[PDB]
């Protein structure tokens, strides 16, 4: 989020290693949307009944 | 040169709008008859009642078509607190056979409990969204992810637009260095309130719409609001319809260097203001090239305004639905 | 040089080649294509596949190959065969029968759908006749023949929907769209005739012939730079160009040859280059302008006697140049047709050009193709 073109270009190197390809992107794939959908997927698969990890990321954000 | 009849279609009620194909030949009438009538201009041109099916409850004010890359899909609004979505799907493989057609509600956005004052799809360059506004002062912003995945609709965004929403407008945008904006004309009545029209932008780093502007000047319930088609036009213009006619030019004078977004520095001129309709002006309709504007009001007349080589503006047509307009006209200085 | 050809000795005679369509609008070579027999082993229609474009195809002989897929045999020669849509096929029979298939590319078969068993015929002898030209704009279908009848059909019917008969009809050579529902032909009298699909009657709808050596015009086509201006070729060797949708007038009378223009066809990637095929014993690529001062496709080919690739350009400072198009008075000169003969070739009866790509099947028992028409 703080970086830019070099950041997203490098980040794709490990986004591919995390293997996300499904779902159409608009106006070409952007690492931002890539990470957002990645985290959403991590959520919807591993779902704790108490928003534990919601809290975790929120607190790192703060 | 087509003489006018008062004879109307079999709609036993007020006819609200008619929507035409963004690729041609196809039209449809929406009315208070609650039945949506799809007409098709034949090769001879004869348009006949090719389809008619119920779509809503209450007065179905507006039908909006979407380009077939959206699918052959349509939105519609009525007194049902919701917005209905129909794509026409047919059977079989169209090679030299034409099977049976069928109207499909992909979705209907419940839109909380608020009456959809306006609703329409989203522009190409920003992905495929759709916007709904209501007299709640709240604008809901729904999303369909994938191409075969149409029926599903998730409120991607919402913009709270102070007074009750009446008329909405998308900003044309086709540059990555440009941003999508929305103008909102309010039909609430408050002479006190200036800026009855509110303007929001997508600041991309914030990932979010902020208020770009208001028209601190406007205290008149806005009938309709209409961006001028501006994509090669290096600034923007706005047509604003109430009892009078407002035309504004918005030029990026400062685009910021490290503080862009929130508000960006634009000169706004009231480059035109007219009461020539001599009555309340309901709608202004743009030419798709963004060079022509039509204007109608209660007197059932339409005045037709263009820009010159000084870009200033003249009425080049005056069309009467309460009478018979006169012929040609041309002039210079 | 001009991108030499791949020649595949197919050991087969060719009459009709027509791209397998996908309608709408796209640039690729239809890899799939249906072929009507000149005489392959019998008269038949075969399915054939071509490794499109120099990209992903420089192999399977030298520069690609078409391959036989299946075939089904057909009474009466396939003089003409046009496609209603992606896989519905309409061919004329020398038996005077209109034949429509639905192709099965996956099953590699052709389905015998619809037959108008009845067609153009001779009177006073009670003999059958083939069809001169089929016209396919989906799904409306037009047929025209030697005797001069008019055969108007909606798709999918085994009985005549209409045959316009006249107190005046003649032999017909070539047809073309003028508009969506307007049609022109060149005839065997030196006759330019017009019709509208909706309005017809008795005796030809419109008839034309004028000064300028009216000769039996054999081939007509609408330009790859515009349709309502068309070009026709006939006996005299002069090409006649016209602008219509209800009235004729000459763009040009180009003295492009001294003898019959049997068939002419149009360059897609170059809306101003042409090709001509002729069973006078030759086949020419036609090019704008003349002279060897520009790359000569006037004597190009013929194995030896080759000449092309000459150029010079004025910088427009103190230099001036003028050409023929800038004159509007009729009777222009030759415009660069080159006949080509690799080592030996027989009657080439079908050819196709898509972009700068070209295919052609022949009576030379082989196929000739090029990726590029120039260099």
XYZ file of C-alpha atoms in Angstrom:
770
model
C 0.000 0.000 0.000
C 2.883 2.373 0.683
C 4.856 1.224 -2.353
C 4.103 1.405 -6.043
C 5.127 -0.033 -9.386
C 8.268 -1.829 -8.201
C 6.388 -3.007 -5.125
C 3.471 -4.511 -7.058
C 5.730 -5.965 -9.749
C 7.778 -7.771 -7.116
C 4.671 -8.717 -5.125
C 3.336 -10.548 -8.166
C 6.359 -12.850 -7.846
C 4.866 -14.291 -4.664
C 1.222 -13.762 -5.617
C 1.812 -16.251 -8.429
C 3.586 -18.538 -5.946
C 0.353 -18.324 -3.939
C -1.479 -19.312 -7.145
C -4.455 -17.019 -7.647
C -5.891 -16.983 -11.153
C -9.666 -17.356 -10.866
C -12.207 -14.532 -11.351
C -11.951 -11.918 -14.102
C -10.086 -8.692 -13.414
C -11.124 -5.334 -14.849
C -8.680 -2.977 -16.561
C -5.925 -5.590 -16.096
C -4.948 -7.245 -12.816
C -3.824 -4.891 -10.055
C -1.809 -6.160 -7.094
C -4.140 -4.243 -4.777
C -7.239 -6.134 -5.901
C -5.066 -9.249 -6.004
C -4.202 -9.018 -2.306
C -7.752 -8.021 -1.378
C -9.300 -11.043 -3.084
C -6.498 -13.224 -1.705
C -7.299 -12.174 1.848
C -11.036 -12.534 1.200
C -10.408 -16.093 0.015
C -8.259 -16.872 3.047
C -11.181 -15.632 5.122
C -13.956 -17.542 3.425
C -11.986 -20.760 3.613
C -10.590 -20.554 7.169
C -13.478 -19.046 9.128
C -13.305 -18.661 12.908
C -16.629 -17.952 14.595
C -15.267 -14.950 16.503
C -13.621 -12.638 13.912
C -10.241 -13.362 15.524
C -8.302 -12.539 12.437
C -10.508 -9.647 11.488
C -9.217 -8.258 14.763
C -5.647 -9.299 13.977
C -5.396 -7.376 10.721
C -7.417 -4.443 12.078
C -4.986 -4.104 14.971
C -1.928 -4.246 12.745
C -3.601 -1.567 10.623
C -4.037 0.616 13.680
C -41.387 15.812 -41.438
C -43.707 13.555 -39.465
C -47.057 15.080 -38.522
C -48.068 14.463 -34.915
C -50.970 12.399 -33.670
C -52.350 12.374 -30.154
C -52.980 8.645 -30.651
C -50.895 6.552 -28.270
C -49.960 2.936 -27.622
C -52.346 0.588 -25.825
C -50.852 1.616 -22.456
C -53.944 2.506 -20.434
C -51.780 4.677 -18.171
C -49.079 7.325 -18.273
C -46.066 6.219 -20.294
C -42.884 6.965 -18.381
C -39.869 6.487 -20.662
C -38.735 4.754 -23.824
C -35.272 3.204 -24.021
C -33.391 2.418 -27.217
C -30.676 -0.089 -28.021
C -27.112 1.109 -27.646
C -26.483 -0.800 -30.875
C -29.731 -0.008 -32.669
C -33.123 -1.199 -33.998
C -34.605 -2.011 -30.589
C -36.818 0.081 -28.342
C -39.027 -0.388 -25.304
C -41.749 1.609 -23.571
C -42.157 1.787 -19.799
C -45.401 3.147 -18.414
C -47.720 3.143 -15.431
C -49.541 0.221 -17.092
C -46.954 -1.953 -15.218
C -46.342 -3.954 -18.418
C -43.037 -3.337 -20.186
C -43.492 -3.306 -23.962
C -40.480 -4.167 -26.116
C -40.916 -2.932 -29.675
C -38.545 -3.723 -32.528
C -38.029 -1.417 -35.491
C -38.374 -3.837 -38.388
C -36.370 -3.636 -41.582
C -39.412 -1.871 -42.991
C -39.245 0.053 -39.704
C -42.654 -1.093 -38.475
C -42.244 -1.520 -34.730
C -44.816 -3.876 -33.230
C -45.546 -5.103 -29.715
C -42.904 -7.810 -29.793
C -42.834 -8.282 -26.018
C -44.846 -7.098 -23.035
C -44.278 -8.456 -19.548
C -44.781 -7.197 -16.011
C -41.639 -6.046 -14.211
C -42.397 -4.062 -11.023
C -45.075 -2.627 -8.791
C -46.132 1.007 -8.889
C -45.233 3.601 -11.495
C -42.290 2.214 -13.464
C -40.522 5.505 -14.080
C -37.432 4.398 -15.946
C -36.003 1.635 -18.101
C -32.277 1.649 -18.869
C -30.658 -0.652 -21.398
C -27.061 -1.830 -21.255
C -24.694 -2.612 -24.091
C -24.727 -6.296 -25.061
C -21.205 -6.626 -23.685
C -23.113 -6.153 -20.445
C -25.221 -8.898 -21.840
C -28.513 -7.898 -23.397
C -29.402 -6.642 -19.942
C -31.667 -3.883 -18.597
C -32.472 -2.117 -15.340
C -35.854 -0.685 -14.339
C -37.229 1.358 -11.444
C -40.709 1.781 -9.984
C -42.740 2.312 -6.820
C -41.567 -0.975 -5.330
C -38.650 0.239 -3.160
C -36.503 -1.909 -5.456
C -34.861 -2.056 -8.872
C -35.566 -4.905 -11.294
C -33.070 -6.410 -13.747
C -34.060 -8.231 -16.923
C -31.887 -9.830 -19.574
C -33.600 -11.418 -22.550
C -32.303 -14.959 -23.014
C -33.316 -17.133 -25.952
C -33.052 -20.859 -26.534
C -30.917 -22.701 -29.104
C -27.820 -21.757 -31.122
C -28.388 -18.855 -33.491
C -26.983 -20.022 -36.820
C -30.047 -19.968 -39.063
C -32.569 -20.928 -36.374
C -34.438 -18.624 -33.984
C -35.931 -20.378 -30.976
C -38.076 -19.018 -28.180
C -37.174 -15.969 -26.111
C -37.715 -15.333 -22.409
C -37.399 -12.432 -19.981
C -34.963 -13.007 -17.106
C -34.814 -11.182 -13.810
C -31.136 -11.497 -13.067
C -31.738 -9.547 -9.873
C -33.766 -6.927 -8.096
C -31.922 -4.668 -5.674
C -34.135 -4.162 -2.627
C -32.339 -0.856 -1.964
C -33.126 -0.920 1.768
C -36.669 0.453 2.019
C -36.260 3.472 -0.231
C -37.791 4.430 -3.570
C -35.296 4.326 -6.443
C -35.299 7.892 -7.732
C -32.691 7.054 -10.370
C -30.809 3.953 -11.457
C -28.359 3.143 -14.228
C -25.357 1.001 -15.162
C -21.725 2.013 -14.795
C -19.307 3.198 -17.500
C -16.934 0.890 -19.329
C -13.542 2.022 -18.072
C -14.280 1.649 -14.353
C -15.358 -1.950 -14.383
C -18.977 -3.029 -14.463
C -20.938 -1.492 -11.599
C -24.416 -0.022 -11.280
C -25.767 2.930 -9.302
C -29.106 3.441 -7.556
C -30.297 6.595 -5.819
C -33.314 7.128 -3.612
C -35.179 9.885 -1.807
C -33.193 8.702 1.195
C -30.222 10.859 0.244
C -28.385 7.533 -0.072
C -26.818 6.070 -3.201
C -26.226 2.322 -3.345
C -23.549 0.909 -5.619
C -23.799 -2.740 -6.649
C -21.411 -5.167 -8.269
C -21.349 -8.292 -10.432
C -17.946 -10.046 -10.475
C -17.777 -12.220 -13.584
C -19.167 -12.377 -17.108
C -21.469 -15.392 -16.731
C -22.191 -14.390 -13.149
C -24.855 -11.707 -13.681
C -27.719 -12.310 -11.266
C -25.748 -11.539 -8.106
C -25.520 -8.044 -6.734
C -23.441 -6.778 -3.847
C -23.354 -3.182 -2.682
C -19.749 -2.372 -3.551
C -20.116 1.213 -2.363
C -22.572 3.719 -0.954
C -22.366 7.498 -1.097
C -24.468 9.538 1.310
C -25.498 12.633 -0.638
C -27.105 14.876 2.037
C -30.604 15.810 0.760
C -32.876 13.236 -0.896
C -31.458 11.912 -4.173
C -33.394 12.836 -7.322
C -31.172 12.952 -10.419
C -27.734 11.405 -10.843
C -24.962 11.594 -13.406
C -21.821 9.626 -14.264
C -18.662 11.412 -15.340
C -17.187 10.012 -18.567
C -13.647 8.819 -17.954
C -11.230 7.012 -20.247
C -7.792 7.933 -18.873
C -5.885 6.175 -16.118
C -4.636 9.657 -15.206
C -8.313 10.664 -14.977
C -10.836 9.690 -12.296
C -14.538 8.824 -12.177
C -16.842 11.459 -10.759
C -20.556 11.774 -10.089
C -22.831 14.796 -10.093
C -26.043 14.834 -8.071
C -28.890 17.292 -8.571
C -31.300 17.485 -5.644
C -35.031 18.123 -5.997
C -35.477 19.009 -2.322
C -36.847 22.516 -1.819
C -34.692 24.802 0.302
C -33.928 28.372 -0.804
C -31.505 28.461 2.111
C -29.332 25.662 0.761
C -26.689 26.549 -1.804
C -24.880 23.793 -3.617
C -28.035 21.739 -4.046
C -25.886 19.809 -6.532
C -23.094 17.702 -5.044
C -20.051 16.304 -6.810
C -17.928 13.325 -5.783
C -14.668 11.876 -7.125
C -12.792 8.623 -6.734
C -9.480 9.376 -5.050
C -7.688 6.176 -5.952
C -5.122 6.154 -3.167
C -7.995 6.565 -0.729
C -9.814 4.066 -2.960
C -12.896 6.140 -2.283
C -15.259 8.877 -3.381
C -14.844 12.215 -1.672
C -16.969 15.309 -2.214
C -15.372 17.155 -5.110
C -17.730 20.126 -5.210
C -21.156 21.639 -4.828
C -22.850 24.389 -6.803
C -22.958 26.994 -4.065
C -25.556 28.959 -5.982
C -28.255 26.327 -6.363
C -31.304 26.471 -4.118
C -33.836 25.181 -6.709
C -35.134 21.585 -6.733
C -33.171 20.058 -9.600
C -35.300 18.395 -12.243
C -32.482 16.560 -14.006
C -28.691 16.682 -14.169
C -26.581 15.921 -17.230
C -22.850 15.833 -17.782
C -21.835 16.775 -21.282
C -20.109 13.865 -23.048
C -16.472 14.799 -22.456
C -13.732 12.287 -23.201
C -11.675 14.162 -25.767
C -12.973 17.341 -24.217
C -10.088 18.320 -21.922
C -12.505 19.641 -19.271
C -16.143 19.126 -18.460
C -19.490 20.874 -18.857
C -22.742 20.370 -16.960
C -26.360 20.948 -17.961
C -28.744 21.555 -15.067
C -32.542 21.533 -15.451
C -35.054 23.354 -13.225
C -37.314 26.331 -13.917
C -34.292 27.639 -15.861
C -31.288 26.322 -17.755
C -27.814 26.208 -16.209
C -24.680 25.413 -18.194
C -21.304 25.222 -16.483
C -17.720 24.838 -17.654
C -15.277 23.086 -15.338
C -11.638 23.347 -16.385
C -8.751 21.782 -14.449
C -6.690 24.830 -13.569
C -4.602 23.120 -10.892
C -4.398 19.337 -10.681
C -2.257 19.406 -7.501
C 1.161 17.767 -7.214
C 1.046 15.981 -3.854
C -2.436 16.897 -2.620
C -4.685 15.699 -5.447
C -8.109 14.389 -4.522
C -10.645 15.571 -2.003
C -11.093 18.606 -4.216
C -9.123 19.427 -7.356
C -8.741 22.971 -8.648
C -11.302 23.668 -11.380
C -12.590 26.905 -12.802
C -16.377 26.774 -13.051
C -18.188 29.301 -15.213
C -21.938 29.684 -15.575
C -21.153 29.631 -19.267
C -24.879 29.764 -19.934
C -28.142 30.524 -18.169
C -31.503 30.693 -19.916
C -35.188 31.042 -19.108
C -36.112 30.862 -22.794
C -38.488 27.980 -22.062
C -40.437 30.495 -19.924
C -41.435 27.566 -17.674
C -39.932 24.803 -15.565
C -37.431 22.799 -17.614
C -37.677 19.080 -16.983
C -34.969 17.309 -18.950
C -31.883 18.034 -21.019
C -30.715 15.361 -23.448
C -27.217 15.245 -24.874
C -26.085 14.150 -28.267
C -23.793 11.150 -27.876
C -20.936 13.083 -29.468
C -21.356 15.633 -26.689
C -22.031 18.619 -28.935
C -25.837 19.095 -28.819
C -28.385 19.542 -26.047
C -32.178 19.279 -26.165
C -34.354 20.860 -23.493
C -38.000 20.338 -22.593
C -40.388 21.817 -20.058
C -44.042 22.001 -19.071
C -45.006 23.970 -22.187
C -44.208 20.837 -24.209
C -41.419 22.527 -26.151
C -37.817 21.511 -26.783
C -35.019 23.983 -27.384
C -31.854 22.850 -29.023
C -28.552 24.378 -28.049
C -25.034 24.047 -29.404
C -21.585 25.550 -29.045
C -19.847 27.690 -31.661
C -16.197 28.237 -32.576
C -16.036 30.463 -29.527
C -17.781 27.453 -27.917
C -20.545 29.823 -26.749
C -24.069 28.530 -26.977
C -27.155 29.189 -29.051
C -30.547 27.637 -29.427
C -30.532 26.030 -32.860
C -33.959 24.459 -32.481
C -37.351 25.309 -30.971
C -39.850 22.493 -31.240
C -43.440 22.677 -30.098
C -45.613 19.868 -28.795
C -48.345 22.353 -27.949
C -48.155 23.883 -31.435
C -46.474 23.843 -34.838
C -42.850 25.088 -34.984
C -41.578 27.396 -37.729
C -39.062 26.434 -40.417
C -35.346 26.973 -40.903
C -33.072 29.578 -39.305
C -29.439 30.658 -39.717
C -27.405 33.691 -38.631
C -23.865 34.901 -38.004
C -22.852 37.887 -35.870
C 10.529 -11.106 -54.990
C 7.085 -11.413 -53.385
C 6.951 -14.163 -50.720
C 7.320 -17.309 -52.816
C 4.523 -19.858 -52.776
C 4.035 -23.167 -51.072
C 2.912 -25.698 -53.676
C 1.309 -28.914 -52.466
C 0.907 -31.560 -55.145
C -2.572 -32.592 -54.046
C -3.038 -34.888 -57.052
C -6.481 -33.310 -57.379
C -8.482 -30.921 -59.561
C -10.149 -27.944 -57.857
C -13.243 -25.927 -58.806
C -14.632 -24.067 -55.784
C -13.072 -22.794 -52.551
C -15.074 -20.805 -49.993
C -14.015 -19.859 -46.481
C -15.740 -21.543 -43.665
C -17.559 -18.577 -42.153
C -17.965 -17.430 -38.570
C -19.805 -14.294 -39.738
C -19.689 -11.093 -37.652
C -16.133 -9.754 -38.433
C -12.563 -11.206 -37.855
C -9.152 -11.330 -39.614
C -8.021 -14.985 -39.337
C -7.873 -17.464 -42.150
C -10.723 -19.924 -41.706
C -8.628 -22.994 -41.081
C -11.746 -24.963 -41.985
C -12.966 -24.599 -45.555
C -15.304 -26.502 -47.856
C -14.195 -27.455 -51.343
C -16.293 -28.163 -54.435
C -14.869 -30.560 -56.995
C -13.698 -29.779 -60.453
C -12.953 -33.455 -60.673
C -11.089 -34.758 -57.645
C -11.999 -38.397 -58.059
C -15.668 -37.702 -58.627
C -17.501 -34.459 -58.235
C -17.675 -34.117 -54.462
C -17.494 -31.604 -51.656
C -14.581 -32.127 -49.294
C -13.673 -30.574 -45.970
C -10.145 -29.246 -45.729
C -7.923 -27.631 -43.132
C -5.128 -25.097 -43.560
C -2.510 -24.199 -40.957
C -3.278 -20.475 -41.014
C -0.553 -17.848 -41.405
C 3.232 -18.044 -41.406
C 3.012 -17.858 -37.619
C 2.613 -21.361 -36.094
C 2.767 -22.751 -39.643
C 5.986 -23.154 -41.626
C 5.883 -26.937 -41.706
C 4.025 -30.090 -42.825
C 5.654 -29.746 -46.269
C 7.114 -26.311 -46.819
C 5.040 -23.375 -45.530
C 2.031 -25.263 -44.185
C -0.469 -27.669 -45.772
C -4.194 -28.090 -46.361
C -5.442 -31.510 -45.317
C -8.453 -33.553 -46.411
C -10.965 -34.184 -43.655
C -13.993 -35.882 -45.182
C -16.093 -35.623 -48.307
C -19.485 -36.450 -49.780
C -20.217 -36.875 -53.459
C -22.469 -34.604 -55.488
C -24.330 -34.905 -58.823
C -23.616 -31.993 -61.126
C -20.430 -29.955 -60.857
C -19.952 -27.529 -57.978
C -19.759 -24.400 -60.110
C -20.616 -22.236 -57.122
C -20.965 -22.742 -53.390
C -21.559 -20.033 -50.787
C -22.273 -20.247 -47.080
C -25.480 -18.971 -45.491
C -23.941 -18.930 -42.013
C -21.257 -20.578 -39.888
C -22.094 -24.150 -40.962
C -24.952 -24.016 -43.512
C -23.707 -24.594 -47.050
C -25.428 -23.837 -50.367
C -24.091 -25.137 -53.675
C -25.401 -25.240 -57.217
C -25.518 -28.482 -59.158
C -24.949 -28.872 -62.864
C -28.031 -31.060 -62.495
C -29.845 -27.813 -61.727
C -30.303 -28.610 -58.043
C -29.825 -26.273 -55.089
C -28.108 -28.220 -52.324
C -27.804 -27.216 -48.678
C -25.749 -28.981 -46.018
C -25.211 -28.479 -42.361
C -21.584 -29.361 -41.731
C -20.392 -31.409 -38.762
C -16.796 -30.327 -38.159
C -16.501 -32.513 -35.060
C -18.129 -35.562 -36.700
C -16.306 -34.623 -39.926
C -19.425 -35.121 -42.036
C -21.900 -33.135 -44.106
C -25.643 -33.329 -43.532
C -27.909 -33.366 -46.570
C -30.449 -30.813 -45.404
C -32.389 -29.071 -48.131
C -32.794 -29.540 -51.853
C -34.579 -27.431 -54.391
C -34.644 -30.234 -56.931
C -35.999 -27.737 -59.470
C -33.992 -24.930 -61.095
C -33.231 -22.956 -64.290
C -34.036 -24.893 -67.455
C -34.179 -24.707 -71.260
C -37.510 -24.314 -73.059
C -38.408 -26.015 -76.332
C -36.106 -28.916 -75.452
C -37.287 -29.720 -71.903
C -33.682 -29.945 -70.659
C -32.289 -29.046 -67.225
C -29.731 -26.278 -66.602
C -27.204 -25.403 -63.877
C -27.377 -22.145 -61.899
C -25.166 -19.194 -62.849
C -25.016 -17.410 -59.492
C -26.148 -17.991 -55.924
C -26.620 -15.068 -53.562
C -26.467 -15.617 -49.814
C -27.199 -12.899 -47.272
C -28.530 -14.800 -44.297
C -31.100 -15.957 -44.506
C -32.421 -14.637 -47.840
C -31.325 -16.625 -50.896
C -31.242 -15.661 -54.578
C -30.548 -17.829 -57.603
C -29.937 -16.747 -61.180
C -29.298 -18.899 -64.196
C -28.591 -19.205 -67.895
C -32.234 -19.036 -68.958
C -32.689 -15.896 -66.873
C -35.225 -16.842 -64.195
C -35.094 -15.357 -60.715
C -35.213 -17.700 -57.751
C -36.081 -16.032 -54.454
C -36.121 -18.187 -51.327
C -36.270 -17.854 -47.583
C -33.852 -20.235 -45.899
C -35.013 -23.778 -45.201
C -37.554 -24.713 -47.918
C -37.570 -27.545 -50.475
C -40.120 -25.867 -52.763
C -39.676 -22.647 -54.711
C -40.731 -19.655 -52.676
C -40.740 -17.567 -55.844
C -39.354 -17.696 -59.361
C -39.718 -14.437 -61.262
C -40.252 -15.213 -64.925
C -40.165 -12.638 -67.693
C -41.193 -11.881 -71.226
C -37.523 -10.838 -71.475
C -34.579 -12.772 -70.011
C -31.017 -13.593 -71.028
C -27.722 -15.236 -70.113
C -26.139 -14.002 -66.897
C -22.425 -13.882 -66.055
C -21.648 -12.282 -62.700
C -23.614 -10.827 -59.807
C -22.814 -8.576 -56.875
C -24.469 -6.793 -53.997
C -25.003 -3.136 -54.602
C -26.709 -2.711 -51.229
C -28.208 -5.058 -48.662
C -31.219 -5.696 -50.899
C -30.041 -4.292 -54.246
C -28.349 -6.404 -56.907
C -26.359 -5.986 -60.122
C -25.176 -8.299 -62.867
C -22.964 -8.208 -65.916
C -24.289 -10.188 -68.833
C -23.272 -11.876 -72.085
C -24.589 -8.992 -74.212
C -22.496 -6.212 -72.685
C -25.411 -5.654 -70.367
C -25.473 -4.122 -66.890
C -28.684 -5.038 -65.123
C -30.185 -3.904 -61.813
C -32.866 -5.139 -59.428
C -34.203 -4.497 -55.941
C -35.070 -7.518 -53.818
C -38.468 -6.156 -52.808
C -39.647 -4.845 -56.195
C -39.560 -6.917 -59.398
C -41.776 -7.790 -62.357
C -41.796 -8.930 -65.993
C -38.687 -8.269 -68.148
C -35.452 -7.079 -66.471
C -35.870 -4.491 -63.731
C -33.117 -2.377 -65.201
C -31.062 -2.683 -68.358
C -27.960 -0.795 -69.484
C -25.460 -0.667 -72.348
C -23.595 2.361 -73.716
C -20.739 3.445 -75.947
C -17.341 2.171 -74.903
C -17.239 -1.164 -76.722
C -19.978 -3.141 -74.950
C -18.563 -6.661 -74.705
C -19.929 -9.741 -72.888
C -18.891 -8.987 -69.312
C -18.038 -12.158 -67.432
C -17.017 -11.091 -63.933
C -18.249 -8.369 -61.595
C -17.359 -7.530 -58.003
C -17.781 -4.697 -55.492
C -14.554 -2.968 -54.563
C -12.594 -3.814 -51.405
C -12.561 -0.053 -50.842
C -16.302 0.349 -51.548
C -19.307 -1.765 -52.540
C -21.611 0.652 -54.407
C -18.772 1.280 -56.831
C -18.131 -1.971 -58.678
C -15.855 -3.315 -61.421
C -16.655 -5.516 -64.425
C -14.564 -7.360 -66.977
C -15.463 -8.661 -70.411
C -14.263 -9.638 -73.857
C -12.548 -6.474 -75.069
C -9.841 -6.403 -72.411
C -11.036 -3.135 -70.877
C -12.162 -2.942 -67.235
C -15.304 -0.878 -66.592
C -15.898 0.734 -63.190
C -19.216 2.198 -62.030
C -21.030 3.967 -59.149
C -24.652 2.999 -58.445
C -27.388 2.312 -56.177
C -29.989 3.206 -58.810
C -27.905 4.750 -61.598
C -24.696 3.844 -63.419
C -21.722 6.050 -64.294
C -18.030 5.317 -65.031
C -15.194 5.873 -62.619
C -12.877 4.370 -65.228
C -12.559 2.473 -68.476
C -9.069 1.071 -67.948
C -7.355 -0.392 -71.011
C -6.027 -3.152 -68.757
C -5.906 -5.882 -71.413
C -6.790 -6.802 -74.990
C -8.938 -9.870 -74.349
C -11.636 -11.425 -72.182
C -11.643 -10.926 -68.425
C -13.015 -14.269 -67.273
C -12.900 -13.754 -63.496
C -11.738 -10.880 -61.299
C -11.505 -10.833 -57.499
C -10.497 -8.280 -54.912
C -7.575 -7.822 -52.515
C -8.670 -7.372 -48.883
C -5.454 -6.056 -47.301
C -5.095 -3.802 -50.343
C -8.466 -2.293 -51.304
C -6.840 -1.147 -54.563
C -5.027 -4.307 -55.786
C -6.844 -6.919 -57.853
C -6.475 -10.423 -59.207
C -7.705 -12.032 -62.404
C -7.957 -15.676 -63.387
C -8.577 -16.755 -66.956
C -8.801 -20.080 -68.736
C -7.349 -18.312 -71.731
C -4.275 -19.918 -70.172
C -3.150 -17.360 -67.627
C -3.623 -15.759 -64.226
C -2.598 -12.224 -63.329
C -2.055 -10.152 -60.235
C -3.353 -6.646 -60.970
C -1.685 -3.628 -59.386
C -2.325 0.106 -59.239
C -0.564 2.191 -61.902
C 1.831 0.838 -64.538
C 5.506 0.959 -65.554
C 8.437 -1.017 -64.149
C 9.503 2.144 -62.286
C 7.315 0.785 -59.473
C 7.640 -2.866 -58.352
C 6.612 -4.708 -61.484
C 3.641 -6.974 -61.050
C 3.153 -6.708 -64.784
C 5.763 -9.313 -65.800
C 6.335 -10.743 -62.348
C 6.434 -14.482 -62.041
C 6.689 -16.886 -64.998
C 9.671 -18.648 -63.291
C 12.071 -16.716 -65.487
C 11.388 -13.381 -67.185
C 10.956 -12.032 -63.665
C 10.919 -8.300 -62.960
C 9.708 -6.302 -59.952
C 10.906 -4.183 -57.028
C 11.883 -0.819 -58.510
C 11.204 2.437 -56.683
C 11.870 6.186 -56.607
C 10.216 8.955 -54.576
C 10.207 12.750 -55.061
C 10.808 14.825 -51.916
C 8.315 17.481 -53.117
C 10.750 20.400 -53.092
C 11.364 21.195 -56.778
C 10.036 17.878 -58.078
C 6.626 17.159 -59.631
C 4.835 13.928 -60.567
C 1.418 13.065 -61.996
C -0.477 9.844 -62.643
C -3.484 8.445 -64.457
C -6.181 8.593 -61.755
C -5.793 12.379 -61.789
C -7.372 12.271 -65.261
C -11.143 11.847 -65.468
C -11.463 11.490 -69.239
C -12.176 7.799 -69.959
C -10.056 5.195 -71.770
C -7.081 4.942 -69.385
C -4.063 2.714 -70.010
C -2.880 -0.660 -68.739
C -2.647 -1.105 -64.941
C -0.070 -3.820 -64.177
C -1.338 -7.408 -64.511
C 1.302 -10.127 -64.213
C 0.793 -13.716 -65.332
C 2.594 -16.321 -63.244
C 3.674 -19.846 -64.199
C 5.935 -21.629 -61.670
C 7.119 -24.512 -63.834
C 3.759 -25.512 -65.320
C 0.143 -24.933 -64.269
C -3.281 -25.969 -65.536
C -6.659 -24.259 -65.246
C -6.846 -22.647 -61.805
C -10.544 -22.775 -61.045
C -10.675 -21.462 -57.474
C -8.661 -18.888 -55.555
C -8.989 -16.894 -52.348
C -7.172 -13.943 -50.802
C -7.408 -12.937 -47.148
C -5.182 -10.093 -46.084
C -1.917 -10.517 -47.951
C -2.482 -14.281 -47.731
C -3.523 -16.298 -50.776
C -4.719 -19.825 -51.482
C -5.646 -21.289 -54.833
C -6.601 -24.706 -56.120
C -6.346 -25.613 -59.766
C -6.488 -28.142 -62.544
C -2.698 -28.275 -62.193
C -3.458 -31.084 -59.732
C -2.003 -29.099 -56.805
C -2.513 -26.076 -54.528
C -0.556 -22.822 -54.408
C -0.442 -20.515 -51.398
C 1.498 -17.495 -50.155
C 1.671 -15.687 -46.813
C 2.506 -12.341 -48.421
C 1.488 -10.937 -51.779
C 4.436 -8.525 -51.936
C 7.797 -7.758 -50.354
